[PDB]
Amino acid sequence: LFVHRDTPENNPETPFDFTPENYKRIEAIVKNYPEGHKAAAVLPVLDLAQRQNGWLPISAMNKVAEILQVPPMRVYEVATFYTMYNRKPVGKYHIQVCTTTPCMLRNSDSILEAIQKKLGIKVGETTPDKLFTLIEVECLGACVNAPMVQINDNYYEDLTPKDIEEIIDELKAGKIPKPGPRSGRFSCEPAGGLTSLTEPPKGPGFGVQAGL
Amino acid sequence: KTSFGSLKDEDRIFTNLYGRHDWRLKGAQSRGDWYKTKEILLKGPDWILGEVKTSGLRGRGGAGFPTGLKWSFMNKPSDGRPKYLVVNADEGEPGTCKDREIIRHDPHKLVEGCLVGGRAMGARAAYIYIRGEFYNEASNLQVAIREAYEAGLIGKNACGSGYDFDVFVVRGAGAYICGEETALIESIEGKQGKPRLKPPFPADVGVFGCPTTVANVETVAVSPTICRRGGAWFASFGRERNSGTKLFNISGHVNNPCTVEEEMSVPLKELIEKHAGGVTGGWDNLLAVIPGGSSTPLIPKSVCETVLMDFDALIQAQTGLGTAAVIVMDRSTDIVKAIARLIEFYKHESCGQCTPCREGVDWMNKVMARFVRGDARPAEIDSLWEISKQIEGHTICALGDGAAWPVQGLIRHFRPELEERMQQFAQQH
Amino acid sequence: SGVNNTKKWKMEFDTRERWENPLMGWASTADPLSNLVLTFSTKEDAVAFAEKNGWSYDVEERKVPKPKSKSYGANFSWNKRTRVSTK
Ligand SMILES: Cc1cc2nc3c(=O)[nH]c(=O)nc-3n(C[C@H](O)[C@H](O)[C@H](O)COP(=O)(O)O)c2cc1C
Ligand code: SF4
Ligand code: FES
Structure with missing residues (x-):
């Protein structure tokens, strides 16, 4: 929903303030923009509150409005426009499965159902332990590595039902699995052998025209 | 020349595309980056704009405007306002992941491009807007920028050239529409990512009103190489007015989905077979290809037999080069469902600002969802065509066109499939 | 926003008493001119008509909206207050 209703857990009196170290980070954010245009810092600072707090209560939105001297409504507009802001609490690991056509064509559905069975939840829900939250997202910009998921800040790619269940098993154990493809390649090169960039790259000055 | 493709590694620009060599400053310099940047800067903006002009370079973001002419809009006297370069790293087009490889594996190409391109425009700084999901890539770019600052390649007296230049990185927060140029500017300013009407054009009133x-x-990332090796070297690739090398993404129903650099005007068939290992199940198993990302209309196998991958060739095939993100669908695909999911994507991404896309795309999505199940009558096909034409060319920004076009491609080339599905539903009910 | 009902000159008369009908509560009137409203191309035509019919009259000069200076670009001013905080 894109309207707010005060609750005991989410209301203007809910405690939130940036830590002393995050205030230092805020100063560097605000210094990135011309003077007289502090409102440009709304997105990075709002994201900073989420990284500290995990999600965005209304009191966190109010604090950002105060620090940057912007009307709170303009901050509410940003919080509700960009989908990476969590206006409700999310589990420790926010699993985000891409289901757009390129990933769908390479069986993102088998990934989605594998997660649902293993965690016993439905898309949109949080586990009772509050460790995992599962949602579908649009193209995450790793289409040649489909099917893939993002968990918090990391991408996990070239997934199969076995691979994702192994990633979730590692997460449940406190281990932090390595990101990237799980199929054998390292990034976006074709499997079965490079079809380009096999020879060593040229060095400084190669092919440089005259006059420089 | 009359045949294109088979680009040699000596002529490839992004030589660390696969990240098998050091992506940091030392590896970049060993590969030719940051070489004679001072000389290029001291040549002057008009010389730099001349080389980009002669190179025939066209925008790689999807619209394909001639880059040299576009950049020359900034080659004008100052008026007290600062001038800025905004590098679009939102990379949100479904099927497109080329810009991700540049940022994380060749970051110093992008940083040097910002300085060289910024110098041509007389900008004081560059803001690189990178989508918020590319966290690890943004951090990689941030590390490279610090190395450039420490080495004195950017910042005060960049490359000892007497020209100051800053490179800032700002992350998005989840919005495909923030890849649109004016929506990107609005997002940097701390507002909702809603596109601006034009005029004014950004070269007159842009980020922070400047x-x-x-x-x-x-x-941006190819401009330093164009200056070092010359625009003529770049224009010796691809057909006339389709110059240069191009990064391709081949995904979907291929054997080895991959990113690769190849000559412009390479045949679509040759690209899929040489680099992606061919269509899954053989070329005979091909059904349709989306050649330039979700915003470009699909083309059937018959068209894919001989078409060339460049701006002009794909326009004559009733589509476009777009981002050159090739999405391949074999004959096991439910083509109506594939397209219906793209319309669902545009429904989730429309900013909602202007009426035809706010309401039209959601309307098209509802009709397509029924077309998937066959729960419609054939008269609704011509209705859906007309609706898509009421969105196209009537919206503020090109997202509305980007949603209309995929629907048009489906109806143009697969009307029998849509009608067959309605016939099957009717007998079952 | 339509301006098509502001093209012509009108002539109406002074409002007189309306009272509640004792039976039904309907609005009764004894003013035969209560509904009379004439239309004229110009105020000269209206004045001419009023003069020959012996009615005393007041003429109010037509109010036309004054031309405004509009600029979409001002929504994003670098240093002026016209910059919009939202779209
Ligand atoms: C909905 C939409 C999304 C877009 N996304 C991107 C993008 O992710 N990256 C990009 O470079 N251009 C994107 N564009 C195109 C930009 O608006 C603009 O044309 C481009 O940044 C200009 O740079 P270029 O001339 O070098 O291509 C998008 C356009 C639209 C309408
Ligand atoms: S076409 Fe869609 S995305 Fe573009 S301005 Fe209109 S509503 Fe927003
Ligand atoms: S379609 Fe899933 S990452 Fe692009």
Whole structure:
């Protein structure tokens, strides 16, 4: 929903303030923009509150409005426009499965159902332990590595039902699995052998025209 | 020349595309980056704009405007306002992941491009807008920028050239529409990512209200090489008015989905077979290809037999080069469902600002969802065509066109499939 | 926003008493001119008509909206207050 209703857990009196170290980070954010245009810092600072707090209560939105001297409504507009802001609490690991056509064509559905069975939840829900939250997202910009998921800040790619269940098993154990493809390649090169960039790259000055 | 493709590694620009060599400053310099940057800067903006003009380079962000002419809009006297370069790293087009490889594996190409391109425009700084999901890539770029600052390649007296230049990185927060040039500017300003009407054009009133040029990551990252090796060297690739090398993404129903650099005007068939290992199940198993990302209309196998991958060739085939993100669908695909999911994507991504896309795309999505099940009558096909034409060319920004076009491609080339599905539903009910 | 009902000159008369009908509560009137409203191309035509019919009259000069200076670009001013905080 894109309207707010005060609750005991989410209301203007809910405690939130940036830590002393995050205030230092805020100063560097605000210094990135011309003077007289502090409102440009709304997105990075709002994201900073989420990284500290995990999600965005209304009191966190109010604090950002105060620090940057912007009307709170303009901050509410940003919080509700960009989908990476969590206006409700999310589990420790926010699993985000891409289901757009390129990933769908390479069986993102088998990934989605594998997660649902293993965690016993439905898309949109949080586990009772509050460790995992599962949602579908649009193209995450790793289409040649489909099917893939993002968990918090990391991408996990070239997934199969076995691979994702192994990633979730590692997460449940406190281990932090390595990101990237799980199929054998390292990034976006074709499997079965490079079809380009096999020879060593040229060095400084190669092919440089005259006059420089 | 009359045949294109088979680009040699000596002529490839992004030589660390696969990240098998050091992506940091030392590896970049060993590969030719940051070489004679001072000389290029001291040549002057008009010389730099001349080389980009002669190179025939066109925008790699999806619209394909001639880059040299576009960048020359900033080559004008100052008026007290600062001038900015905004590098578009939102990379949100479904099927497109080329800009991701440049940022994380060749970051110093992009940083040097910002300085060289910024110098041509007389900008004081560059803001690189990178989508918020590319966290690890943004951090990689941030590390490279610090090395450039420490080495004195950017910042005060960049490359000892007497020209100051800052490179800032700002992350998005989840919005495909923030790849649109004016929506990107609005997002940097702390507002909802809603596009601006034009005029004014960004070269007159842009970010913070100042003269601005928005350029795609790949467009920027190739400019330093064009200056070093010459625009003529770049124009010796691809057909006339389709110059240069191009980064391709081949995904979907291929054997080895991959990113690769190849000559412009390469045949679509040759690209899929040489680099992606061919269509899954053989070329005979091909059904349709989306050649330039979800915003470009699909083309059937018959068209894919001989078409060339460049701006002009794909326009004559009733589509476009777009981002050159090739999405391949074999004959096991439910083509109506594939397209219906793209319309669902545009429904989730429309900013909602202007009426035809706010309401039209959601309307098209509802009709397509029924077309998937066959729960419609054939008269609704011509209705859906007309609706898509009421969105196209009537919206503020090109997202509305980007949603209309995929629907048009489906109806143009697969009307029998849509009608067959309605016939099957009717007998079952 | 339509301006098509502001093209012509009108002539109406002074409002007189309306009272509640004792039976039904309907609005009764004894003013035969209560509904009379004439239309004229110009105020000269209206004045001419009023003069020959012996009615005393007041003429109010037509109010036309004054031309405004509009600029979409001002929504994003670098240093002026016209910059919009939202779209
Ligand atoms: C909905 C939409 C999304 C877009 N996304 C991107 C993008 O992710 N990256 C990009 O470079 N251009 C994107 N564009 C194109 C930009 O608006 C603009 O044309 C481009 O940044 C100009 O740079 P170029 O001339 O070098 O291509 C998008 C356009 C639209 C309408
Ligand atoms: S076409 Fe869609 S995305 Fe573009 S301005 Fe209109 S509503 Fe927003
Ligand atoms: S379609 Fe899933 S990452 Fe692009």
